[PDB]
Design a protein around this motif. Sequence first.
Motif, short mmCIF file in Angstrom:
data_model
loop_
_atom_site.label_atom_id
_atom_site.label_comp_id
_atom_site.label_asym_id
_atom_site.label_seq_id
_atom_site.Cartn_x
_atom_site.Cartn_y
_atom_site.Cartn_z
N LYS A 42 0.81 -1.21 0.00
CA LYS A 42 0.00 0.00 0.00
C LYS A 42 0.84 1.26 0.00
O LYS A 42 0.29 2.36 0.06
CB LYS A 42 -0.95 0.01 1.21
CG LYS A 42 -1.94 -1.16 1.23
CD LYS A 42 -2.79 -1.15 -0.06
CE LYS A 42 -3.84 -2.26 -0.10
NZ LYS A 42 -4.83 -2.01 -1.21
N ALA A 71 -4.21 11.63 13.56
CA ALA A 71 -5.63 11.37 13.32
C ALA A 71 -6.18 10.37 14.32
O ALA A 71 -7.32 10.50 14.77
CB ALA A 71 -5.85 10.87 11.90
N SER A 92 -10.83 8.53 2.68
CA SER A 92 -9.45 8.50 2.24
C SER A 92 -8.99 7.07 2.03
O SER A 92 -8.39 6.76 1.01
CB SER A 92 -8.55 9.22 3.25
OG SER A 92 -8.42 10.61 2.92
N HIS A 93 -9.32 6.19 2.97
CA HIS A 93 -8.93 4.78 2.90
C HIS A 93 -9.67 3.85 1.97
O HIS A 93 -9.21 2.77 1.60
CB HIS A 93 -9.03 4.09 4.25
CG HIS A 93 -8.00 4.42 5.23
ND1 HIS A 93 -8.09 4.19 6.62
CD2 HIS A 93 -6.73 4.98 5.01
CE1 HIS A 93 -6.89 4.62 7.18
NE2 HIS A 93 -6.07 5.09 6.22
N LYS A 96 -9.62 6.42 -2.20
CA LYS A 96 -8.27 6.64 -2.67
C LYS A 96 -7.42 5.37 -2.66
O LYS A 96 -6.97 4.94 -3.72
CB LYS A 96 -7.60 7.71 -1.80
CG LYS A 96 -6.48 8.52 -2.46
CD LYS A 96 -6.05 9.67 -1.54
CE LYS A 96 -7.29 10.41 -1.05
NZ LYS A 96 -7.02 11.66 -0.27
N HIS A 97 -7.24 4.74 -1.49
CA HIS A 97 -6.15 3.80 -1.22
C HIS A 97 -6.58 2.34 -1.11
O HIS A 97 -5.72 1.46 -1.08
CB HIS A 97 -5.49 4.20 0.10
CG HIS A 97 -4.79 5.52 0.02
ND1 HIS A 97 -3.78 5.76 -0.87
CD2 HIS A 97 -5.06 6.70 0.63
CE1 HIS A 97 -3.40 7.02 -0.76
NE2 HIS A 97 -4.17 7.62 0.13
N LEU A 104 -6.31 -2.63 8.97
CA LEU A 104 -6.47 -1.84 10.18
C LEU A 104 -6.35 -2.71 11.42
O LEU A 104 -5.96 -2.22 12.49
CB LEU A 104 -7.81 -1.12 10.16
CG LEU A 104 -8.07 -0.21 8.95
CD1 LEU A 104 -9.40 0.51 9.18
CD2 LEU A 104 -6.94 0.81 8.72
N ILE A 107 -2.32 -3.04 11.87
CA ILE A 107 -1.69 -1.89 12.52
C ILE A 107 -2.12 -1.80 13.98
O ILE A 107 -1.34 -1.32 14.81
CB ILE A 107 -1.98 -0.57 11.77
CG1 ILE A 107 -0.90 0.44 12.13
CG2 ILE A 107 -3.31 0.02 12.18
CD1 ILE A 107 -0.93 1.67 11.28
N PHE A 138 -13.10 1.87 16.69
CA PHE A 138 -12.65 2.64 15.54
C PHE A 138 -12.73 1.81 14.24
O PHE A 138 -13.22 2.30 13.22
CB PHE A 138 -11.24 3.15 15.83
CG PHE A 138 -10.37 3.28 14.62
CD1 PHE A 138 -10.47 4.39 13.80
CD2 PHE A 138 -9.44 2.29 14.31
CE1 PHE A 138 -9.66 4.52 12.69
CE2 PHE A 138 -8.63 2.41 13.19
CZ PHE A 138 -8.73 3.51 12.38
C1 HEM Z 1 -4.72 3.54 12.88
C2 HEM Z 1 -4.91 3.31 11.62
C3 HEM Z 1 -4.75 4.34 10.58
C4 HEM Z 1 -4.95 5.66 10.62
C5 HEM Z 1 -5.45 6.50 11.77
C6 HEM Z 1 -4.65 6.19 9.38
C7 HEM Z 1 -4.77 7.53 9.12
C8 HEM Z 1 -4.45 8.10 7.93
C9 HEM Z 1 -4.51 9.46 7.58
C10 HEM Z 1 -4.94 10.59 8.44
C11 HEM Z 1 -4.13 9.60 6.32
C12 HEM Z 1 -4.01 10.88 5.49
C13 HEM Z 1 -5.39 11.41 5.16
C14 HEM Z 1 -5.59 12.34 3.99
O1 HEM Z 1 -4.79 13.22 3.67
O2 HEM Z 1 -6.62 12.22 3.31
C15 HEM Z 1 -3.84 8.33 5.88
C16 HEM Z 1 -3.38 8.10 4.64
C17 HEM Z 1 -3.03 6.85 4.29
N1 HEM Z 1 -3.13 5.73 4.95
FE1 HEM Z 1 -3.77 5.50 6.61
N2 HEM Z 1 -4.25 5.22 8.59
C18 HEM Z 1 -4.28 4.07 9.25
C19 HEM Z 1 -3.97 2.80 8.81
C20 HEM Z 1 -3.47 2.53 7.55
C21 HEM Z 1 -2.96 1.32 7.06
C22 HEM Z 1 -2.90 0.04 7.78
C23 HEM Z 1 -2.55 1.52 5.78
C24 HEM Z 1 -1.99 0.60 4.82
C25 HEM Z 1 -1.44 -0.53 5.09
C26 HEM Z 1 -2.81 2.87 5.50
C27 HEM Z 1 -2.48 3.45 4.33
C28 HEM Z 1 -2.63 4.79 4.15
C29 HEM Z 1 -2.16 5.34 2.95
C30 HEM Z 1 -1.54 4.56 1.82
C31 HEM Z 1 -2.54 6.64 2.96
C32 HEM Z 1 -2.23 7.65 1.94
C33 HEM Z 1 -0.91 8.18 2.16
C34 HEM Z 1 0.35 7.79 1.11
O3 HEM Z 1 0.14 7.47 -0.08
O4 HEM Z 1 1.52 7.69 1.47
N3 HEM Z 1 -3.32 3.48 6.59
N4 HEM Z 1 -4.00 7.42 6.86
#
Ligand code: HEM
Length: 154
Positions: A42, A71, A92-93, A96-97, A104, A107, A138
């Motif tokens: 990812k 966040a 966002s999750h 987008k991603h 989740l 992590i 959550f």
């Molecule tokens: C506690 C769990 C998590 C939280 C609170 C969290 C929170 C966030 C936040 C705040 C953003 C940026 C939001 C935005 O600008 O729209 C973000 C982006 C992202 N999150 Fe998460 N996330 C979590 C878990 C994960 C996990 C497990 C993955 C992937 C394995 C993930 C992948 C991403 C990616 C890929 C983005 C976009 C950023 C980039 O391309 O580098 N997140 N996340």
Amino acid sequence: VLSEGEWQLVLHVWAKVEADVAGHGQDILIRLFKSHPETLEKFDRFKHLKTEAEMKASEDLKKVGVTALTALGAILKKKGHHEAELKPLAQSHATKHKIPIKYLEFISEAIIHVLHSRHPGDFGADAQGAMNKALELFRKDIAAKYKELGYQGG
Ligand code: HEM
């Protein structure tokens, strides 16, 4: 949905994370990529990071770690009343991603491990159970927004 005392245990150990959000984010993210390396798919931008020391030297990974913990901390400070903060994150999750709920959960194990690796004195079994319940709340609510947007969570 948690008790007042359970949220006090969640927010108490979270205070330990706010003293070093960057370091915590690195350890959590590195713990996530070591235990479940499929999640690293990812992050196209973390592909060239082969070793744990490279990961710890990536300012980009440190920054991504701080963004997530910032966040998460805003969500946990609502003590359950996090609809306005949890819905943009779900979007966002999903759109987008495509982050599956399973990821989740990964992590969350990383968070539990790290928090208990650094602060066992403030993270006994009552605190762990409280934090586990905050994280499950959550995840369970992110998954409802996921469906609401048309993304089942896998
Ligand atoms: C506690 C769990 C998590 C939280 C609170 C969290 C929170 C966030 C936040 C705040 C953003 C940026 C939001 C935005 O600008 O729209 C973000 C982006 C992202 N999150 Fe998460 N996330 C979590 C878990 C994960 C996990 C497990 C993955 C992937 C394995 C993930 C992948 C991403 C990616 C890929 C983005 C976009 C950023 C980039 O391309 O580098 N997140 N996340």
